[PDB]
Design a protein around this ligand. Structure first.
Ligand code: CLA
Ligand code: CLA
Ligand code: CLA
Ligand code: CLA
Ligand code: CLA
Ligand code: CLA
Ligand code: CLA
Ligand code: CLA
Ligand SMILES: CCCCCCCCCCCCCCCC(=O)OC[C@H](COP(=O)(O)OC[C@@H](O)CO)OC(=O)CCCCCCCCCCCCCCC
Ligand SMILES: CC1=C(/C=C/C(C)=C/C=C/C(C)=C/C=C\C=C(C)\C=C\C=C(C)\C=C\C2=C(C)CCCC2(C)C)C(C)(C)CCC1
Ligand code: SF4
Lengths: 125, 73, 739, 72, 68, 73, 138, 80
């Protein structure tokens, strides 16, 4: 799969995966106004539509993407893992996308989320 | 009216970003740690180190001006 | 004279997974984001990859085969779209009322609105490629004919693609082989152009001409017999054009004039067609063909007859030019950039000749009627010709940096003019200033005199006027050419010079284009804009190697940003930076040309003809009186004709409406790059990077602001995009709405 | 112009003009007491910004007044 | 002093790697101003415009380093 | 209309200049000794915290504000 | 005093100007084993005479651009070149191979100047040298 | 004219001397680094300020710096 490897460094294969959502998603995505109007905000609660689900989507992607950069750092193959996406990294992080914000909850609690200010570089004042 | 206000907020923040950055890194950055020795306004620092064009604090005001005009527009 | 190395390179997919292998700098790996951009901008730079001129010539040879392949795929795509996603058959039935349309848009997200009504019960996007007009003149009468043509293209596409592989991985030509210039020419001059022109003349006579004659009669396509049926029944080919009774042998007995039944010299436009007589274009290509076969027998080859271009060149010396063309043979048979520089200059200038000739002498049926297609094919070939003659300056300079050798160029034409480059530019500089004042300065004289209420002082047909005495005198000769200076030509070559105002349907196909002072001025604006563009590019070639500011510029290379803030500042001295500035002026120059074309044809040519013969132009002839001030262009051309696109919201043209804005966006976006520098941008990234170091999400490929060159390359890339997207939408929305 | 095109181009264009005058008869009779040179890098940014600013307000003002005074 | 292989934190100030972590490669020349050669995981800005990378190593003084 | 458009353009110029000379202060007058550990110096200490966030808000405003307008268009 | 043979050259416009006869011009001498073609910094091509050559150029940078060429674009790398600054007063002034050896190579006798007993990052604050004609690097 | 300075961080790689196109620099003996030599700037009267020298030095930050100064006929690279 040397040629497949070279096809793999080609990101936009993901854009093809996105259009494939239509097979399953287009079926239910009919009209879709569920309770956008009724909110007990003590009057006029019609701003309650699904803004919140946007957060889970970006989180499952971001943390997995961070887990791709962090897990690759341990390998000590910086140039290769960046130019050609390692299957184990992209698979593990992206496949655990639903449980990704969950493991991110554990990472935040364990203090794995934020690195040291001392360790981080600072520019001359 | 809702949208043009946020558009203006964009206009004030980005203009402040430029002006404030250019002020803070006026003494120097890790691309030019000794910027203070060269003064406020200087051309650049040659093509060396990747390139240093429009790097000075004077050049920050310069880039900032285009955004003020736009914000006022 | 065939020489070949067998299997010089294995065919393995290992290299595909090792990006940047072709360069020793990139081969080891990426450490910064700059590596990525560099991988792309060095991909086709085969010179910088290997110094073996034999190896690169093999890369180039098989690069062309790859290109011919995609062009075949593209070209086949147009035929396939014309066969299955078109109303061509519907258009062939009623050419004068149906609008040509290909490409159906899918009903989704409300974009179905772009499928506008184009008549004939067909909904889709109206095309301006003039393909429908090409098909008829080519003798197409069925969708299946286009369909078979589309498949043939994919065959060719695959065949071209195989040849590229074969001639680099199986049998690669030797360096000696590519250098057979005298022989290479004899084949292109006769094999490609000669037989190509002869072979097509055979099609025009046996397919196009007889069929198209029936469309004049309006036999309708289905009643018309198939093309090959004209050959199965020579009686059919005889019933039209009686000169087939004595078919062959007048050619061989030299009678010829018998064939005047179908090899004519009418020189005009078929009044039902609005296009050039197919009888002329056939006699034409037959004449061109012969001329080209002939011209392909001049050069030396293996049979001792012919010429040595080396002999001819070297035997051209004069008092003023020392040793003359000596050495020119060598550099044109050792440097590809030397060849490319010339080939672009001419190919580019030619594509412009195509534009200026295709509008005055419409070679296709019902083309002249479609003012959108006329405007679209003209300004199109204008730009292409425009971009090419800029690259002509790029590689003209690269040759000087890379492949110019002083020893092989001593007191010859090349060396001699490098020794007065300061004299050349100093004068081209002055001419540009002279043209600068005496063209634009005139418009400012008018705009000011107008506003001061002094219309008697300004430059105008009505007031004082600069009359193009010569161009007018030239027209007078062209119109009076038949029956005198062209006795065997019935009518003049183009009615733009003068004569009857040809009309089809209720529209003007072509009519005399009078020249006034309004036209005199814009002509000297064109001469002005062209000269400045030459100055920027020419100066870029001669001072590519050295100057009084940087004598060692050649060592710095062709593509470098600068030589530091020293010497007062040395930004953009390189030849690449002369292509950079040369692009903006190629743009600014041609924008005025296509703006001249649009308004002039709208105002003083196009329009509707009433049965009596009186013409009503779309701009009512406001050109000669408003095209002499900038405010007039701002008002009576831009502000007025832009009303079509900005109000396109809610119609089939709504695309052009939002596309008109899209162009505006990337235009302004370009200014972000052209006004700033990476010095600021790198410092900004440092603050941004820190936020990732804070959350442990810093990328391995360290972020780096674009190179100073790329910063400029991206700048011009967007500025020219938006600048042309804007015009592209403005022209289409305008021309489609007017007719 | 001052914002897109940068110095080195103009410096190399000026010296050819310098050449012309020194070589032109009758004109060389006049010699500059100040050597001609292209604007500095900072200068060009400044002048480029100056023009960009003037044109920004003069264009908009002329539109504000005329549009409002013309219509009321 | 500092041994080869020891991971070190930099406290110079103007260094592109100031605050970042480096690795001591060698100690040279006995008596000299900047003996400690350090190699870094990621390159600096150094290089003419268009360079695909930078410098990996630089000499520091012993007094402006911290062991990790 | 003129008086309003006028005074805002005046104001816009003043705000830029205010930061311009604010940058010049750091280049030619700032003393890290006299201003050691005070509110002024500590700004420089976390300048990359300021800028990185001022960048985010601008990114946040620009993508959405432009986003809604292009959506409607 | 010292001289050579002017290279065989048809002439160019990129050459000298008023500065040469007003302010200063520079002179460059070199010895070549054969007559061979070389590139003029003033554009075009010329050929050096066998033996001693002499050439006047308008700028010091031009001579050094030729000097580096002479030492890099020939099979017999000519490193025998000497550059002078000649004033209109007749006064000449030796300039390149200054002391005798090229500056690339360390040579005893050269007095150090421009050096700093200090890191570049250890320069004083601008406020320190306020309203004094001096800059931090002084 | 412009000002050229050398700092104690130089490592005597001599790359700057052979980069300068106007012969402004030269190497001299020094006991501060292993190469036992340091860059010098005796002929600043002829430096234009191209900053080719700074481009060549490999120290984390430059050991040689060019502080642009009062312009002259020479420091502007004027051939007239
Ligand atoms: C399919 C079998 C095959 C294989 C395994 C190879 C393998 C190789 N080729 Mg060959 N080549 C092939 C077919 C093949 N090639 C064909 C069909 C052509 C004619 C177009 C060429 C012309 C060619 C040249 C001139 C060169 C090579 C080189 C190489 C070597 C390095 C280039 C590289 O891999 O980076 C991968 C690069 C790409 C995959 C480029 C893709 C970018 C575009 C968009 C392709 C252009 C369009 C294309 C022609 C048409 C596609 C669409 C169409 C089907 C509708 C490598 C051993 C180079 C070499 O020898 O190394 C120094 C060399 O210079 N090839
Ligand atoms: C290279 C030039 C070119 C261009 C710019 C297009 C562009 C287009 N094609 Mg065509 N096509 C081409 C060549 C080209 N084609 C060739 C050479 C063939 C024959 C092999 C075809 C056969 C073809 C078919 C059968 C269809 C298109 C369709 C389309 C449209 C939608 C594409 C799509 O499905 O999304 C990409 C999806 C992933 C789009 C306008 C579609 C169309 O016309 O709309 C209904 C359609 O179904 N094309
Ligand atoms: C040399 C130039 C030339 C070119 C570019 C063409 C091009 C074409 N011809 Mg050919 N033709 C030529 C010479 C040429 N012809 C000569 C010299 C003759 C005399 C025998 C013919 C006799 C001919 C016939 C009988 C037909 C074509 C047809 C066609 C078209 C269909 C292509 C296909 O699908 O397969 C295509 C436009 C076909 C068509 O449908 O016409 C529009 C068709 O059936 N041609
Ligand atoms: C290279 C392109 C080309 C090709 C392939 C052909 C092929 C043909 N032509 Mg020619 N023709 C051509 C160009 C071409 N023509 C040109 C340029 C002219 C103008 C001088 C003519 C004028 C011409 C005449 C007058 C006749 C032919 C005829 C023929 C056919 C003779 C075969 C036969 O009946 O026995 C043959 C299909 C003959 C024909 O129509 O079939 C009976 C016929 O008599 N052609
Ligand atoms: C006859 C065809 C032809 C050929 C074979 C070449 C070949 C070459 N050129 Mg030349 N060039 C040409 C025409 C041609 N050029 C013309 C007409 C111009 C005038 C604009 C130029 C201007 C030019 C310059 C300034 C340079 C070259 C260079 C080169 C070399 C490297 C190019 C490269 O790296 O690709 C890389 C290509 C890219 C990285 C893509 C850039 C992005 C593009 C082109 C924008 C396209 C806009 C897009 C179509 C519309 C937007 C759509 C979008 C929204 C999706 C290579 C030998 C370079 C060189 O010689 O190396 C030192 C170089 O400096 N060319
Ligand atoms: C429906 C269409 C839509 C689209 C196309 C976008 C697109 C975008 N959003 Mg928006 N967003 C939306 C709806 C949408 N959003 C709605 C309905 C809400 C209300 C909840 C938001 C609230 C929101 C916030 C607060 C932010 C964005 C941001 C962004 C940008 C970067 C995030 C990203 O996608 O990159 C890929 C994902 C990553 C790079 C990792 C995750 C990054 C995120 C967004 C932070 C994690 C979410 C967290 C729980 C909330 C942040 C803390 C909060 C208290 C401030 C991107 C342009 C970010 C931005 O503009 O920064 C400049 C930003 O911070 N969005
Ligand atoms: C209209 C043109 C334009 C645009 C879109 C921008 C946009 C931006 N500027 Mg720039 N600027 C401009 C002109 C422009 N500027 C000009 C003329 C100057 C004078 C030189 C400047 C000087 C300037 C400075 C000094 C700074 C900026 C900064 C910024 C960023 C601030 C973040 C933000 O506002 O929201 C978010 C981003 C956007 C609104 C732009 C996104 C554009 C699109 C449409 C997103 C979608 C991408 C699209 C799908 C890609 C497909 C393309 C494909 C076909 C190739 C933003 C990216 C600041 C910055 O860098 O932020 C930290 C910064 O400090 N600008
Ligand atoms: C600020 C940026 C922005 C935002 C917030 C939106 C938001 C929206 N757009 Mg607009 N759009 C934008 C920019 C934006 N757009 C731009 C720049 C363009 C020009 C290209 C468009 C062109 C456009 C069109 C033509 C249309 C929209 C439509 C929509 C709506 C579709 C809802 C949907 O996707 O359902 C469902 C999709 C999802 C929920 C996606 C996630 C599905 C996964 C599988 C769920 C996983 C859960 C775990 C939504 C309100 C559509 C509409 O109906 O308007 C009201 C519509 O037809 N947009
Ligand atoms: C309306 C404006 C006023 C009109 C007035 C009429 C002026 C007509 C212009 C005369 C051109 C002079 C040609 C030199 C005739 C000529 O070639 O001389 C001969 C000489 C070389 O001749 P040789 O004897 O060396 O030839 C033998 C060998 O060289 C073999 O090549 O060429 C030169 O010396 C270079 C001079 C170029 C001059 C640059 C002129 C730039 C173009 C100016 C004209 C533009 C008009 C537009 C179309 C091009
Ligand atoms: C459209 C198209 C296509 C198609 C094409 C075609 C198919 C065509 C063609 C063509 C052809 C089909 C051609 C042909 C032919 C020919 C020629 C060109 C000829 C010739 C000749 C000669 C010149 C000779 C003569 C003679 C003499 C004189 C002597 C004796 C006798 C003889 C006869 C030998 C394709 C799809 C691919 C692609 C796309 C486009
Ligand atoms: S670019 Fe920024 S740096 Fe390289 S030169 Fe023109 S200015 Fe001095």
């Amino acid at each position: 799969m040397d040629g497949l490897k070279s096809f793999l460094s080609t990101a936009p294969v993901m854009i093809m995966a996105l259009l494939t959502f239509t097979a399953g998603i287009l079926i239910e995505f009919n009209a879709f106004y569920p309770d956008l109007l009724f909110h007990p905000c003590s009057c006029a609660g019609d701003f309650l539509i699904p803004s919140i689900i946007f957060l889970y989507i970006a989180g499952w992607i971001g943390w997995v993407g961070r887990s791709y950069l962090i897990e690759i750092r341990e390998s000590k193959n910086p140039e290769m893992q960046e130019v050609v996406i390692n299957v184990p990294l992209a698979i593990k992080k992206m496949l655990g996308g639903f449980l990704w914000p969950l493991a991110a909850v554990g990472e935040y609690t364990s203090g794995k989320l934020v690195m040291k200010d001392s360790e981080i570089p600072t520019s001359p004042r | 009216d809702f949208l043009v206000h946020h558009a203006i907020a964009l206009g004030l923040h980005t203009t402040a970003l430029i002006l404030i950055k250019g002020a803070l890194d006026a003494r120097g950055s890790k691309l030019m740690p000794d910027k203070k020795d060269f003064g406020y306004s200087f051309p650049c620092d040659g093509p060396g180190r990747g390139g240093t064009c429009d790097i000075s604090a004077w050049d920050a005001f310069y880039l900032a001006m285009f955004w003020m005009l736009n914000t006022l527009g | 004279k065939v020489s070949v190395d067998n299997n010089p390179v294995p065919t393995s997919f290992e290299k595909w997974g090792k990006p940047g292998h072709f360069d020793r700098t990139l081969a080891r790996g990426p450490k910064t984001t700059t590596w990525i951009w560099n991988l792309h901008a060095n991909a086709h730079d085969f010179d910088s990859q290997t110094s073996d001129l034999e190896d690169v010539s093999r890369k180039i040879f098989s690069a062309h085969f790859g290109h011919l392949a995609v062009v075949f795929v593209w070209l086949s795509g147009m035929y396939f779209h014309g066969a299955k996603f078109s109303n061509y058959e519907g258009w062939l039935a009623d050419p004068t009322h149906i609008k040509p349309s290909a490409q159906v848009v899918w009903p989704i997200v409300g974009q179905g609105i772009l499928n506008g009504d184009v008549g004939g019960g067909f909904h889709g996007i109206q095309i301006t490629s003039g393909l429908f007009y090409l098909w008829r003149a080519s003798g197409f009468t069925d969708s299946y004919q286009l369909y078979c043509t589309a498949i043939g293209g994919l065959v060719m596409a695959a065949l071209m693609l195989f040849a590229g592989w074969f001639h680099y991985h199986v049998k690669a030509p030797k360096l000696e082989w590519f250098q057979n210039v005298e022989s290479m020419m004899n084949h292109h001059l006769a094999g490609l152009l000669g037989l190509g022109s002869l072979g097509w003349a055979g099609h025009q006579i046996h397919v196009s001409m007889p069929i198209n004659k029936l469309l004049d009669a309006g036999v309708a396509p289905k009643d018309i017999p198939l093309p090959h049926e004209f050959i199965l029944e020579p009686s059919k080919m005889a019933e039209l054009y009686p000169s087939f009774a004595q078919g062959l042998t007048p050619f061989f007995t030299l009678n010829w004039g018998v064939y005047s039944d179908f090899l004519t010299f009418k020189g005009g436009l078929n009044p039902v067609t609005g296009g050039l007589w197919l009888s002329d274009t056939a006699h034409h290509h037959l004449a061109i063909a012969v001329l080209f076969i002939i011209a392909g027998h001049m050069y030396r080859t293996n049979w001792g007859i012919g010429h040595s271009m080396k002999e001819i060149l070297e035997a051209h010396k004069g008092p003023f030019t020392g040793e003359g063309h000596k050495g020119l043979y060598e550099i044109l048979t050792t440097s590809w950039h030397a060849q490319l520089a010339i080939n672009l200059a001419l190919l580019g200038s030619l594509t412009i000749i195509v534009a200026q000739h295709m509008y005055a002498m419409p070679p296709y049926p019902y083309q002249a009627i479609d003012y959108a297609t006329q405007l679209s094919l003209f300004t199109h070939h204008m730009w292409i010709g425009g971009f090419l003659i800029v690259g002509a300056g790029a590689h003209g300079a690269i040759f000087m940096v890379r492949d110019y050798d002083p020893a092989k160029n001593v007191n010859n034409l090349l060396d001699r003019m490098l020794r007065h480059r300061d004299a050349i530019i100093s004068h081209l500089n002055w001419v540009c200033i002279f043209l600068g004042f005496h063209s634009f300065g005139l418009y400012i004289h008018n705009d000011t005199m107008r506003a001061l209420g002094r219309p008697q002082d300004m430059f105008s047909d009505t007031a004082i006027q600069l009359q193009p005495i010569f161009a007018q005198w030239v027209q007078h000769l062209h119109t009076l050419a038949p029956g005198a200076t062209a006795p065997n030509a019935l009518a003049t070559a183009s009615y733009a010079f003068g004569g009857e105002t040809i009309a089809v349907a209720g529209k003007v196909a072509m009519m005399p284009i009078t020249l006034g002072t309004a036209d005199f001025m814009v002509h000297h604006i064109h001469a002005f804009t062209i000269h400045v563009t030459a100055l920027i590019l020419l100066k870029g070639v001669l001072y590519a190697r050295s100057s009084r500011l940087v004598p060692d510029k050649a060592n710095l290379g062709f593509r470098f940003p600068c030589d530091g803030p020293g010497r007062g500042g040395t930004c953009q001295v390189s030849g690449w930076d002369h292509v950079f500035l040369g692009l903006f002026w190629m743009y600014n120059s041609l924008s005025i040309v296509i703006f001249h074309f649009s308004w002039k044809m709208q105002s003083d040519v196009w329009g509707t003809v009433s049965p009596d013969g009186s013409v009503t132009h779309v701009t009512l002839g406001n050109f000669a009186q408003s095209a002499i001030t900038i405010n007039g262009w701002l008002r009576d051309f831009l502000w007025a004709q832009a009303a079509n696109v900005i109000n396109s919201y809610g119609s089939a043209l709504s695309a052009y409406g939002i596309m008109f804005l899209a162009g505006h966006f990337v235009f302004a976006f370009s200014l972000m790059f052209l006004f700033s520098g990476r010095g600021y941008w790198q410092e900004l990234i440092e603050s941004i990077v820190w936020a990732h170091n804070k959350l442990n999400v810093a990328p391995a490929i360290q972020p780096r602001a674009l190179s100073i060159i790329q910063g400029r390359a991206v700048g011009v890339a967007h500025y020219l995009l938006g600048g042309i997207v804007t015009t592209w939408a403005f022209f289409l929305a305008r021309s489609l709405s007017i007719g | 112009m001052f914002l897109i095109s940068w110095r080195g181009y103009w410096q190399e264009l000026i010296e050819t003009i310098v050449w012309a005058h020194e070589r032109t008869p009758l004109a060389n009779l006049v010699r500059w007491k100040d050597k001609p040179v292209a604007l500095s890098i900072v200068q060009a940014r400044l002048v480029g910004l100056a023009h960009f600013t003037v044109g920004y307000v003069l264009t908009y003002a002329a539109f504000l007044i005329a549009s409002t005074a013309g219509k009321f | 002093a500092l041994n080869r292989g020891d991971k070190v934190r930099i406290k110079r100030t103007e260094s592109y790697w100031y605050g970042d972590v480096g690795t001591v490669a060698s100690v040279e020349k006995s008596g000299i101003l900047y003996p400690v050669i350090v190699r870094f995981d990621r390159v600096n800005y150094n290089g003419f415009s268009g360079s695909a990378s930078g410098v990996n190593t630089n000499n520091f003084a012993e007094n402006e380093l911290e062991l990790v | 209309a003129a008086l309003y458009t006028h005074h805002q353009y005046i104001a816009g110029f003043l705000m830029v200049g205010a930061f311009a000379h604010g940058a010049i202060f750091f280049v030619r007058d700032y003393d890290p000794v006299a201003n050691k550990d005070n509110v002024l110096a500590r700004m420089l200490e976390h300048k990359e915290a300021l800028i990185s966030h001022l960048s985010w808000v601008s990114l946040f405003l620009g993508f959405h504000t432009l986003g809604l307008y292009v959506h409607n268009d | 005093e010292l001289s050579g043979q002017p290279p065989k050259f048809g002439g160019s416009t990129g050459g000298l100007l008023s500065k040469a006869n007003r302010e200063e011009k520079y002179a460059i001498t070199w010895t070549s084993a054969s007559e061979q073609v070389f590139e003029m910094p003033t554009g075009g091509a010329a050929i050096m005479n066998e033996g001693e050559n002499l050439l006047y150029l308008a700028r010091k940078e031009q001579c050094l651009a030729l000097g580096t060429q002479l030492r890099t674009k020939f099979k017999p790398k000519i490193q025998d070149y000497k550059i002078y600054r000649v004033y209109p007063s007749g006064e000449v002034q030796y300039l390149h191979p200054a002391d005798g050896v090229f500056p690339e190579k360390v040579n005893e006798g050269r007095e150090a100047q421009g050096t700093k007993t200090r890191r570049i990052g250890q320069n004083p604050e601008p406020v320190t040298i306020k309203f004094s004609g001096k800059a931090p690097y002084e | 004219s412009h000002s050229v300075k050398i700092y104690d961080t130089c490592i005597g790689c001599t790359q700057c001397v052979r980069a300068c196109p106007l012969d402004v620099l030269e190497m001299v003996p020094w006991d501060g680094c292993k190469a036992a030599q340091i860059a010098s700037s005796p002929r600043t009267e002829d430096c234009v300020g191209c900053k080719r020298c700074e481009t060549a030095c490999p120290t984390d930050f430059l050991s040689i710096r060019v502080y642009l100064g009062a312009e002259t006929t020479r420091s502007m690279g004027l051939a007239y």
